[PDB]
């Protein structure tokens, strides 16, 4: 997909990571065929250094990690995200996702 989608996903990391749950999004995306075991393990995992800092932002950062991974996936995967988010029913983020396009 075009770089405009990249700037949208990076600039809207906060709203996307806050509207959406971590585990539900992970299970949805992996059951969407978006991820394999190795890449989901990598995305969930972190440096291990952030173990010292507060867990409160750890999973969120991991959730942030998810975005940083899915921007890597093919142009239609974002549409899959559009689909996957509707499986989440987290449409508040979906409208913002679709706002930049068309």
């Amino acid at each position: 997909m075009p770089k405009r989608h990249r700037e949208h996903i990076r600039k809207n990391l906060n709203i996307l990571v806050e509207w959406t749950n971590y585990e539900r999004l992970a299970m949805e995306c992996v059951q969407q065929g978006i991820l394999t075991v190795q890449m989901l393990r990598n995305t969930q995992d972190l440096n291990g250094k952030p173990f010292n800092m507060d867990e409160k932002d750890v999973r969120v950062e991991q959730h942030r990690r998810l975005l940083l991974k899915i921007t890597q996936r093919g142009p239609t995967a974002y549409n899959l995200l559009i689909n996957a988010l509707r499986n989440i029913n987290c449409l508040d983020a979906a409208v913002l996702l679709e706002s930049v396009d068309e």
Partner: protein, 310 residues
């Protein structure tokens, strides 16, 4: 055609999207065991992907097809298409890049094969290239025979370098250029490699120096032409700042200073200066063992060497 040549083009894609951390499905034969390790400790993708390319090119031409054709198809979905669309069709600019690059191997035949990539400097030099203004120049200085020629060619080879530089790169070795005749033929050959055309009527034996002024003016005029806006004229082993004093015609030149006088003559502001006699500039023990493996060519017997000399 080939796969290895087309690899060097789109480093930007891999640094942008590819990550070796999630790609650890190594076939034993496609890699040398440790590099599905050493890439990771060597940062994420700025150096990890560069050394990935270096290692990938280290082997022969088949495991790269293995990488693109089965290793890549499991996880990367953007990434099938570019190689299939690049391997066969081969665009016009890729063709000229590989032509110039095969030329750059052609005129070396020693470093062209016996090279060992010294990452960290190369990592800290092409940035000045991607910045270099049409008037500035880059200085690199270090110990005699520091691979200054080696590293210059190493960095030059970066596809980014040819691509921005508009693939026009030209070399001059400043050997015995300490006489106001020793540069005349230098200017002549520079003209000829620029163009084998010359108005030989202006030759006046009255002033070899007035003649050098005339040729500098003429070659400067040729410089300020639409294609030659960014033509790379590197000077090798600058004998003295006097030689450069002729070689100053508002170009994206760059110099590998060999002597302290030469490198200290230049202004650090108007001319960026990079060292080699520096702790981080020098070679890692990994670099040294890679070189002794390039030469001795014995992995099991590599351990039989001590730890000395740099």
């Amino acid at each position: 055609y080939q796969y290895k040549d087309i690899l060097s083009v789109f480093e930007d894609a891999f640094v942008d999207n590819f990550d070796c951390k999630d790609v650890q499905d190594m076939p034993k034969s496609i890699l040398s065991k440790e590099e599905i390790d050493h890439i990771i400790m060597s940062k994420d993708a700025v150096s990890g992907t560069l050394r990935l390319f270096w290692t990938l090119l280290s082997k022969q031409e088949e495991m790269v097809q293995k990488f693109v054709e089965e290793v890549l198809r499991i996880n990367y979905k953007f990434l099938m298409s570019p190689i299939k669309t690049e391997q066969r069709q081969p665009s016009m600019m890729t063709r000229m890049y590989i032509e110039q690059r095969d030329r750059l191997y052609n005129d070396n035949q020693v470093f062209a094969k016996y090279n060992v990539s010294r990452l960290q400097p190369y990592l800290k030099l092409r940035q000045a290239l991607l910045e270099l203004r049409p008037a500035k120049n880059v200085l690199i200085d270090g110990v005699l025979g520091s691979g200054k020629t080696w590293v210059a060619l190493d960095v030059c080879l970066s596809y980014k370098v040819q691509c921005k530089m508009d693939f026009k790169i030209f070399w001059l070795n400043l050997k015995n250029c300490n006489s106001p005749e020793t540069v005349l033929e230098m200017l002549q050959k520079l003209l000829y490699q620029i163009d084998p055309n010359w108005t030989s009527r202006s030759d006046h034996s009255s002033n070899i120096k007035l003649r050098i002024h005339s040729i500098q003016a003429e070659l400067r005029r040729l410089l300020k032409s639409k294609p030659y806006e960014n033509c790379l004229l590197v000077l090798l082993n600058v004998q003295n700042a006097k030689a450069w004093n002729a070689f100053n015609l508002s170009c994206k030149i760059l110099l590998t200073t060999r002597f302290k006088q030469v490198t200290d003559f230049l202004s650090a502001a108007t001319t960026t200066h990079i060292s080699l006699d520096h702790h981080s500039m020098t070679l890692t023990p990994d670099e040294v063992k890679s070189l002794l493996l390039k030469y001795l060519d014995c992995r099991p017997q590599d351990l039989p060497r001590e730890v000395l000399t740099t």
